[PDB]
């Protein structure tokens, strides 16, 4: 929710979009077409994986029994051992739940962020030939074909080719 | 396996375990909680 994109001004996601986290749905003369963006999908996924590899780590740290399940140790040192162990259970448990909550906050906002980085980029491509309607869409003020879409997608769309055209409108 | 307790071995890559606080060897750290889910996806918004 940090950046306003996901669950903000984009109304929802597309359960039909199997092949990415982020993509394009267009409407022009010829037809309607959908394709998921690679460069930014990869980008997010990669930050998630880089998080995982940090946690699914194995501690190389070994511990032994100070304790005895078969013949109980003497009661005073038994009680010190138990009290220390519970205190460690407290620390680790707090650490576990905090670590996970915080990673989650950050993961969600990582996603909001990459959406709102796709948007703001395409916007930048199109200069003055279209408009922010505000539901995560661009109204194009010139007729455009399906090879014009692809040129937006793979980031080649030239503006000053369609400038004047799109301007009286 | 590298993590043992009286009732067997804890074999896992996860950082924590809720199986046995007395496990010994090289173990995930013991925690109170039965479950802690880590998001690997984005906010899910359906219609």
């Amino acid at each position: 929710g940090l950046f306003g994109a996901i669950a903000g001004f984009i109304e929802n996601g597309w359960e039909g979009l199997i092949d990415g986290w982020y993509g394009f749905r267009h409407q022009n003369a010829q037809g309607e077409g959908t394709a998921a963006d690679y460069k930014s999908t990869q980008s997010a996924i990669d930050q998630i994986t880089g998080k995982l590899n940090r946690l699914i780590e194995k501690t190389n740290q070994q511990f032994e029994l100070i304790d005895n399940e078969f013949t109980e140790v003497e009661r005073q040192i038994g009680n010190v051992i138990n009290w220390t162990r519970d205190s460690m259970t407290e620390v680790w448990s707090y650490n576990a739940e905090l670590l996970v909550a915080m990673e989650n906050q950050h993961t969600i906002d990582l996603a909001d962020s990459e959406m709102n980085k796709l948007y703001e980029r395409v916007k930048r491509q199109l200069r003055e030939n279209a408009e922010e309607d505000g539901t995560g869409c661009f109204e194009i003020f010139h007729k455009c074909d399906d090879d014009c879409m692809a040129s937006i997608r793979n980031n080649t769309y030239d503006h000053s080719k369609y400038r004047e055209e799109a301007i009286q409108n | 396996g590298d993590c043992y307790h009286s009732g067997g071995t804890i074999i896992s890559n996860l950082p924590f375990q809720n199986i046995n606080s007395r496990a010994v060897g090289k173990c995930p750290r013991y925690v109170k909680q039965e479950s802690l889910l880590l998001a690997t996806g984005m906010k899910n918004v359906p219609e």
Partner: antibody
Amino acid sequence: QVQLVQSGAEVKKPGSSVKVSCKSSGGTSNNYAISWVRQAPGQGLDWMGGISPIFGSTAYAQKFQGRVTISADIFSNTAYMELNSLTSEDTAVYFCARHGNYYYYSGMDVWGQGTTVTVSS
Amino acid sequence: SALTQPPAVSGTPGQRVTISCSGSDSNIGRRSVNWYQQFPGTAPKLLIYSNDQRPSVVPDRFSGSKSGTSASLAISGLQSEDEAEYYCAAWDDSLKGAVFGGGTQLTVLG
């Protein structure tokens, strides 16, 4: 620089199953799709399916659908292919290969060394 | 099958050789083409992707192109080390899976 290291040669009787592994060493491949591609003796390459484990996709070639199970353990950086109901038609070398990306369209640029599976009575 | 290649091509050191790959609308027509090189008993190597793109480690004598539902690999300045099997490949939107050509064996003459 990632290398993919597959499990060793297998010798199998008809009707059995085989599970081959592909370990990503020197780094993770979890953010990429890995495909399984087989090559029967003297024949061409044939796609079996793939998995891209963080993205959450598993795909299968129609001709192997239902007989092959592809999976991954993200924690050991390993992908697996299990083929059931083996016959001599499955005698082949099996490769895992990592795509340039999280999905199966891109060229496969990193390949394992291959695992020979021989089905014989 | 799905993609069709000549079983064999040959040439002399320094000659230019091409290997053709015939497909249909559901693959080459509408999708990008990859080329792989394979030496006997070893894993394939990615030679070309995205139709005409070349990995940095691959010599510039290898080039690819795509027209209609067909593709071509050209090896300029053939070298003795180029004797190998070559496979074309593409996604097929009809089969919903990756497909490969039958392979072309290149022989270095002379």
